[PDB]
């Protein structure tokens, strides 16, 4: 890394106001139908969101115990933005290490904990449940068949991207990126805090981003300096943040923090979702860092819309029977 991160946190140049501050009760389906979820949102308190979180004092060791000591976890080497692997037990030992004794800065942002004990301790915003393509479009019997709690692709019966735990030590940085498949995102700051840089997905910015990615020169170029309008904003303990499709962001961790969040696709910004997919195609992103079964899901979306509206099914007979049996429950 060739730019000074400490200057990026102090300057006032990132002064756009993209984020809308909202009350939980106002974040409903009608709000989504009206605005199409185009604006980033911050809920300074959880009231009215329908979220559920663990005990405020829940630790990384409690996470370990819920998901398994031997579970392999994807870790990010902050200095290089490369990825490595270690068991959750090793991750925990690192995280419990005093700050001065940590040799490297490491970050975990990709621990998907669905189908573990922890899954039920965290509930998403109700509104996301109403619109998430996974919950509303993927054949339910496949989703319910999932047994595996890691993200092993051969075991994966549906796009396993709904519930993540993020564990970040003081000084962690995640460089500019758009979330996979053009997913939208919700993040709840359980303990600690985060600083985000936000860049809107205008055609010009998305062209810059794609160019910046093909350049290979992302350690050297701070992308918020190459755009017209960027917002730096801090999230405090207890806040919830929603990031729309395609928004380009980077994240800094000022204090040891624990976040629960997830990804979702939905039906009100499909064009942007498709744009980001094909940016991934062009920049040659390994399949592992992508939304699993993207187009498969897209097919199922078409079928759901036709069916709910016209009552003509284009699912196989077996799939129709599987579905009817779920409706009988």
């Amino acid at each position: 890394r060739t730019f000074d991160l400490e200057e990026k946190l102090q300057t006032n140049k990132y002064n756009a106001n993209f984020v809308t501050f909202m009350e939980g009760k106002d974040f409903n389906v009608e709000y989504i139908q009206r605005g199409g979820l185009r604006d980033p949102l911050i809920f300074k308190n959880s009231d009215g969101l329908g979220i559920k979180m663990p005990d405020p004092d829940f630790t990384v060791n409690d996470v370990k115990m819920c998901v398994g000591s031997r579970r392999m976890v994807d870790v990010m080497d902050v200095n290089t933005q490369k990825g490595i692997e270690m068991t959750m037990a090793q991750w925990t030992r690192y995280y419990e290490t005093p700050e001065e004794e940590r040799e490297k800065l490491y970050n975990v942002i990709s621990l998907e904990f669905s189908h573990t004990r922890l899954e039920n301790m965290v509930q998403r915003p109700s509104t996301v449940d109403f619109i998430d393509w996974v919950d509303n479009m993927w054949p339910r019997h496949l989703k319910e068949s999932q047994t595996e709690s890691t993200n092993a692709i051969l075991e994966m019966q549906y796009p396993k991207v709904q519930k993540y735990c993020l564990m970040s030590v003081r000084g962690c940085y995640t460089d500019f990126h758009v979330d996979f498949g053009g997913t939208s995102v919700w993040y709840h700051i359980h303990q600690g805090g985060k600083v985000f840089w936000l860049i809107p997905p205008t055609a010009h910015n998305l062209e810059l981003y794609e160019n910046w990615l093909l350049s290979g020169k992302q350690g050297d170029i701070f992308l918020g300096d190459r755009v017209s309008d960027c917002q730096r904003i801090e999230l405090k303990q207890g806040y919830t943040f929603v990031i729309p499709s395609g928004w380009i962001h980077a994240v800094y961790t000022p204090t040891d923090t624990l976040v629960f969040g997830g990804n979702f696709l939905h039906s009100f910004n499909i064009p942007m979702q498709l744009k980001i997919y094909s940016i991934e195609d062009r920049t040659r992103v390994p399949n592992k860092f992508r939304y699993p079964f993207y187009y498969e899901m897209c097919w199922y979306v078409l079928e759901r819309y036709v069916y709910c509206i016209t009552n003509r099914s284009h699912l196989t007979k077996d799939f129709q029977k599987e579905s009817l049996s779920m409706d009988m429950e």
Binding site: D74, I153, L154, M156, F180, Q218, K288, R290
Partner: peptide, 13 residues
């Protein structure tokens, strides 16, 4: 090494 999917990470430098 089982192949995974749905890993959140930006491009490496």
């Amino acid at each position: 090494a089982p192949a995974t999917g749905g890993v959140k990470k930006p491009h490496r430098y």
